[PDB]
Amino acid sequence: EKQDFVQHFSQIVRVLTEDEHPEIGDAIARLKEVLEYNAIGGKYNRGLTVVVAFRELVEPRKQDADSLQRAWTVGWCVELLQAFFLVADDIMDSSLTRRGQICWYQKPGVGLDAINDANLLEACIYRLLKLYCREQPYYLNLIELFLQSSYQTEIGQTLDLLTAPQGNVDLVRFTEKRYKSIVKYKTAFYSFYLPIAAAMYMAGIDGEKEHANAKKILLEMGEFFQIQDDYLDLFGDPSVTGKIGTDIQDNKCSWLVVQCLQRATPEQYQILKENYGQKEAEKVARVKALYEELDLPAVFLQYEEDSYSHIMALIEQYAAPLPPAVFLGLARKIYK
Amino acid sequence: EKQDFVQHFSQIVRVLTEDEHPEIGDAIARLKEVLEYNAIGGKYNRGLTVVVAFRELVEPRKQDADSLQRAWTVGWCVELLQAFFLVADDIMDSSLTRRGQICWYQKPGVGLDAINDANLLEACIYRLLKLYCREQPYYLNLIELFLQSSYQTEIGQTLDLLTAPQGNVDLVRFTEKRYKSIVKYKTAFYSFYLPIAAAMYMAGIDGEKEHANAKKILLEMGEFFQIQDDYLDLFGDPSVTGKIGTDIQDNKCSWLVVQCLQRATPEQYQILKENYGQKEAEKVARVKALYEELDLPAVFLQYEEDSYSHIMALIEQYAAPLPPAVFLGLARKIYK
Numbered sequence A, B: 001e002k003q004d005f006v007q008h009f010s011q012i013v014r015v016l017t018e019d020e021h022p023e024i025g026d027a028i029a030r031l032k033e034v035l036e037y038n039a040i041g042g043k044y045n046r047g048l049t050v051v052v053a054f055r056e057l058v059e060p061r062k063q064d065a066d067s068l069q070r071a072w073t074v075g076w077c078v079e080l081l082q083a084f085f086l087v088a089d090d091i092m093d094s095s096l097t098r099r100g101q102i103c104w105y106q107k108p109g110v111g112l113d114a115i116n117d118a119n120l121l122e123a124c125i126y127r128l129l130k131l132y133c134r135e136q137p138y139y140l141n142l143i144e145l146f147l148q149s150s151y152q153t154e155i156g157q158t159l160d161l162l163t164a165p166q167g168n169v170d171l172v173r174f175t176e177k178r179y180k181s182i183v184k185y186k187t188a189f190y191s192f193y194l195p196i197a198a199a200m201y202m203a204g205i206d207g208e209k210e211h212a213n214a215k216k217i218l219l220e221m222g223e224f225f226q227i228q229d230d231y232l233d234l235f236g237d238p239s240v241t242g243k244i245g246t247d248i249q250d251n252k253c254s255w256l257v258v259q260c261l262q263r264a265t266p267e268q269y270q271i272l273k274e275n276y277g278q279k280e281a282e283k284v285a286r287v288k289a290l291y292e293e294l295d296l297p298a299v300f301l302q303y304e305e306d307s308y309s310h311i312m313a314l315i316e317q318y319a320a321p322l323p324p325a326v327f328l329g330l331a332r333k334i335y336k
């Protein structure tokens, strides 16, 4: 699946850089330059989920070339949203690397103009949508699905940045309730509900109750997903993850820190307190030591299994009337 | 006009902060905090232009409360777009003040999270639109009008940042052709076409030829507008303009610098070259001295009059079949 999807990327790029009012040529050359560098190099879990869900939802007889194309197009739309969020996330998180290369905003000659660059990527989604699905009866729903999903993420992000003030030890606020809402808004909606709900709308399924049912499954899925992203932030092979963790020095409200706090003694708390949210490398090293002390990696592992089962029950409880494989597929690719 | 428009701002804020899923309350409290600080304090030339054009386009008998409300709402939509662009512009331009107060991103405890803050402001537009004009037959056209206008601005901005590389003397590229395209995309479309075209669509006028006709007028208007913004960047009373100029040290392709370059001797060029695009205060002072040397302020003044006349002919040539006052109004408020 992955490869046919990626090969359609040359069509996306050329269409978005088509127009050539040559007054804007330099600007378009820069856009393509932004697309190449930030859309390529990920797993495509989101773009791929749109394509694959579409195939499993639309009558095969009804999968003409045209409609097939609108599907990976809307798939590259979810990847553009991803790219937009990442370029700006890496700046606000002050990241060094992403997807095995330096962050776009760390490239010599880019810096904070990457803010505009990210906005362009956001703009491209809507450019593609009008360019391929304008005469379709789901046009508004897709557009509306991307707008609201963007808002929900911005809100989650706001939550995030709010719970991790810089220069401020924020231990008190790392609760579970809090973590659950952050993750729901900043990751789950756009990474799990969005690409599937887009396939649904494309397959003519726009009922409110089906979408809610899929949502019930997809959100909880998305939560587990972020919890994995957190574990991997600290406990993962960068060469594999293509980026380096910052949550700790960024005083983030991670699943990890939320777990340490629920298992630590006063003596451990204070270690945590004088050590979390600081740039000092050994201070960061101190916290990981706590976590490893507290057996959190086994705990995470225990979670993955407890979680995998819950979602499974969920798919059981709510997949209908969609082919269960729509979700199983997702769960399989994000269950390691 | 201005005041009834501003008083509707408490309705905008309360509606966008309505929802209270209390899990996101802190996030919503921050949004309102972003709305208050960045939507208020400008001239409202854009928001006001939507309201006023609407009154002059819709049959008075047809101006029910409901429809009147959708009008200032869509007016506060153009102001939100403005706010979004400004918050991010001030960061990328590394600004110190805006609208007579420190830039939102210079406030202690904000900094680069203002990137997310700006995105939220963008999101709010579409939130208001669905919240008031969803059942209207111009819904898509407005949404589509804001998306494309955003893209066009991002493109102009890209142009801008590209023509002003930092650390690079870019004199060669400050041509007129170049300046005209930058201004067309980064200012004109969203500041002059956008609020009027939104009123048109709201008045049931969506013909392609009328919009093009209004566009012909509005763009050229918008150009003059930016040229004024440039003059004011250097030659204006900050207390009046509420911000301070940076174009010079930002190595911007200003109308000014474009004019100096067309009037300067080799001896003046070299002064320009060793002095433009640098942070040294006296180096900046050197350039203004050149400009003042070159009689550019009279030149600008000569332009304003030559321009005012052209636009006037334009309104003459293309206002029909819209009430000419739709444009005259605009021209009057931006002709000092």
Ligand SMILES: O=P(O)(O)C(O)(C[n+]1cccc(F)c1)P(=O)(O)O
Pocket (backbone or CB within 6 Å): A085, A086, A089, A093, A153, A157, A186, A187, A229
């Ligand atoms: O591993 P990262 O840093 O990409 C992350 O999970 C991505 N991300 C996730 C959700 C929203 C977002 F804007 C960005 P985080 O949230 O910054 O920790």
Ligand SMILES: O=P(O)(O)C(O)(C[n+]1cccc(F)c1)P(=O)(O)O
Pocket (backbone or CB within 6 Å): B085, B086, B089, B093, B153, B157, B186, B187, B229
């Ligand atoms: O006086 P300023 O700095 O607001 C400006 O005219 C605003 N502005 C105008 C157009 C687009 C934009 F994003 C922002 P500039 O372009 O940054 O010089």
Ligand SMILES: [Mg+2]
Pocket (backbone or CB within 6 Å): A089, A090, A093, A095
């Ligand atoms: Mg990050």
Ligand SMILES: [Mg+2]
Pocket (backbone or CB within 6 Å): A089, A093, A160
């Ligand atoms: Mg983040």
Ligand SMILES: [Mg+2]
Pocket (backbone or CB within 6 Å): A229, A230, A233
């Ligand atoms: Mg992360």
Ligand SMILES: [Mg+2]
Pocket (backbone or CB within 6 Å): B089, B090, B093, B095
């Ligand atoms: Mg500026």
Ligand SMILES: [Mg+2]
Pocket (backbone or CB within 6 Å): B089, B093, B160
């Ligand atoms: Mg600018």
Ligand SMILES: [Mg+2]
Pocket (backbone or CB within 6 Å): B229, B230, B233
């Ligand atoms: Mg300016």
